[PDB]
Each structure stands twice: as C-alpha cells, then as structure tokens.
C-alpha cells in the first residue's frame, strides 16, 4: 500500500542526505513525501562544497529531523535580498569549490556568501535582520544560516579587521550566540578535495508558522536564501 523513502532526493545521484540538505549544487531535485521514512546514517556526512566545522553546531541532525516531517520542499524563492541587507553593499559570493553542470563554480542555495564591496573600510557596528515566513499554510520555516571565517590575514584581506566576528540568532525561544574562529583550522573533511584556508560554520533555526526569525550578524556571515518548508509528521525508524 504505502511507500517509503530513504534517500531524501531520488534522482539526486552521488548526493548523500546531508548533501541535498545543505542545498549543495547538483544535488537539488524533487524531494517527495512518504509517511514511513527510514533512518540510515548515524553520522550524516557531506561530500563536495566548502568544508564544514560540523562539531561547532547542531547541524549534523538536520535531515534526521527533516525525515520526521511528511511533506518536504525547498523554498521556491529567496527569503531576503542579500545585497540589500544592512551594513553596506554585498556581493553574492560564488565559489569554485562547489561545481555546477554548466560551470565549475556555484554555491549553496539555502545560504548565500555575503562579501562587502571594497568600499567597506570602517569601524563597524552590530547589525540585525529579520527572517520572514515565506512557507505555506502549515509548513514550518526551517531556515539554514551560517558564517564564514578564514585565516588571520585573509580575514583582513576580505574584511576590515583580523579580529574574530560575533553572530547570534533567535527564533521560537531558542537563542544562541556564535563567535568565529581564526587560524589553526582543523583538517579538511567532507569536502571536494580542494585546499581552503577558510571554514564554514552551519546551523539552522525553526520558526513555527508566523513566527519571525531574528538574525544578528557581523562580517563573514552566510545569510540564507532558500529555506525548507516541511509540515506534519513522518514515521521514523
């Protein structure tokens, strides 16, 4: 009678569950719904895009929570205009470490890499941005955020100061802060094999239907563009 799904996206070849979860390029596809989904990975491991400091956050259990939801679909449209966020003009950070069928460049769709234009050189002030609820009638807002941090000189090469950056988000009573890490980054893991002195810290926040999402950030943030709209409950096993 009923059917099952172990792979969150069939027809997404060579893509693990966390590959399609982060919105890795060449892993986006139709993610259908089945009331009885099977759990397979104790350690959801990625493969491809920019290396991740997985242990810094609770990011590893995004699909195992998403698999408990019946219907799943990524955001049809962007959540916020990244370039028009406060704190100066921003350039959509593309990258060659996350390739694409047309060109070797690309990046996550769930998150965009914000880079301040070279007009930026000033003592900064903390910033804030809300996160709307674009999702449908009952589908919960599963927003995926993060920030980038590189070596000491590369941060100063990209941003105004070599000093660490401060971030924090809050939604549905869950409030968490984050400070960036500089230098002596751990080994490259779950990447495409290309050397990168920078690292990525990924996390997510849940907004019940109508609940606004708050995001306070500094330089080096990975603002979300696409987000997950999931509702109901799917049987986990």
């Amino acid at each position: 009678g009923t059917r099952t799904r172990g792979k969150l996206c069939p027809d997404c070849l060579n893509c693990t569950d966390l590959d399609v979860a982060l919105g890795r390029p060449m892993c986006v596809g139709t993610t259908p719904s089945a009331k009885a989904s099977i759990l397979h990975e104790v350690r959801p491991v990625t493969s491809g895009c920019f290396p991740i400091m997985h242990d810094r956050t609770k990011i590893r259990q995004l699909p195992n929570l998403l698999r408990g939801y019946e219907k799943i679909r990524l955001s049809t449209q962007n959540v916020i205009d990244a370039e028009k966020a406060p704190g100066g003009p921003y350039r959509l950070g593309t990258s060659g470490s996350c390739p694409n069928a047309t060109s070797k460049i690309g990046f996550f769709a769930t998150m965009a890499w914000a880079v301040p234009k070279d007009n930026y050189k000033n003592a900064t002030n903390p910033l804030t941005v809300e996160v709307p609820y674009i999702c449908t009638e009952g589908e919960d807002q599963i927003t995926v955020w993060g920030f980038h941090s590189d070596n000491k000189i590369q941060m100063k090469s990209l941003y105004g100061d070599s000093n660490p950056q401060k971030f924090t988000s809050s939604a549905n009573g869950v409030t968490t802060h984050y400070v960036s890490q500089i230098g002596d980054f751990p080994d490259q893991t779950e990447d495409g094999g290309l050397p990168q002195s920078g690292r990525i810290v990924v996390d997510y926040m849940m907004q019940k239907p109508g609940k606004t999402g708050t995001i306070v950030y500094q330089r080096g943030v990975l603002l979300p563009q696409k987000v997950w709209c999931a509702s109901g409950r799917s049987k986990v096993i």
Partner: antibody
Amino acid sequence: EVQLVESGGGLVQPGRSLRLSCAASGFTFDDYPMHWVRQVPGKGLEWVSSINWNGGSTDHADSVKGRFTISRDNARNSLYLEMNSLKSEDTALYYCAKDLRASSSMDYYYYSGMDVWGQGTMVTVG
Amino acid sequence: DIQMTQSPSSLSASVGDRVTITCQASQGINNYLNWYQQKPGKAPKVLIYDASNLQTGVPSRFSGSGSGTDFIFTISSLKPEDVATYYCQQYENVPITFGQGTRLDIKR
C-alpha cells in the same frame, strides 16, 4: 569610454624592484577580475599574474613566482603590480587587462578571457 | 602545466580567401579557449571566446570551433583589414598559456 591606462614605465637596472599601476574607467571595476600579461616586442605572449575581483585569491606564474605580487583597490578604480628582484629576461612590454566574466569566484577558477586591454607600458632591464 | 601549440605559424592567402588555424593543447581542455587579434605596435583585441562564441561587436565573418583535444579557428571571407598575428589562449586550471603564436600575411 572604457579605458585602461598603464603607468610607471621607464628604466630599471637588474635586481631592482618596481610598483606598476593601472587606471580603470568606464565600467564597474569591482565585478571583473584582472590579469597582467607581458610581451617581448616582436615576440609571443607570456602571462604574468591574475587576481580575482577580491584580494582573496592571488595566482602567479612560475617565471615570477615569489618575485612579483598583484594588488588592487576597487575604491580607487586602480590596479597595481609589485615587482621585486627584476631579472634580465623580464625585459618586455607589460599589458594591463580586465576579465570579461563578472563571477565573484574567490576560488581557484575565476580567470577567463580579457576583452579589454590597455595600451601597455615598457619595462626595460642598465 | 598547460602548453599551447599552434599549427601554421605563417599563413599566406589571397584576398577574400578562407584561412584556417588550428590550436592543439598539450593536455586536455574542455572548451576553455579564446582567440586574440594583434596588429603590430598596437594592443590586442579578443575575437572568439569559449570555443566558437563570437564576441559582440566584431564582424560576423570570424568563427571558431573545437572541443576536447583539437580546436579550430576560421576566417570565412578575408578582408585586407584582418592582417595580424593570432594567438589562442586557455582559461582552464593553472597559469593561462598561449600558443607560440601564428603570424598571418597576404599574397596578392
């Protein structure tokens, strides 16, 4: 009028160091990566160094590895090339050129065709 | 490292003639190749970008081709205004390399 004007030409004795400059105008200078290309007068083309729109990814040729260095300022619409310990073979005409792709790549693969070249300035090595 | 080698190096052809220049790469490159025109004493200008895509603002008579290991350049009808030395250029990985260049001169 889209212009690329090289500057800082002349004479340098062997072993010296120079700081070449390039002025951009007529286009959004911040979106396109930049390249430097040399050419011995009446001879072929050799590539010098390329940089993305950002200062994040720098790439040098092995012939000038560790001796030359690229730098740019998009707030002033100017491109620089820092040269150290000039060899005798480095005597050539050097061109300033912009990339055609506007991809803000920040990664290894950002370089493409030029489509816009300056008139170039002569580097003489006593 | 990549290296480009162009075939004729010196081409003599009549007015209105179709000339062909090939540029084979040392290693394999997928469509990542461009072409440039350089008259002596003046700055070069691009003609064909990314294997046979003609640059906007250049005459329609020019054309390219190629994929994988062998790449082809083509001038359909020759005008005296086309005299120059031509170079193929790659934009795949590592330092961009040019061929040793091909010179072109006319024969009428």
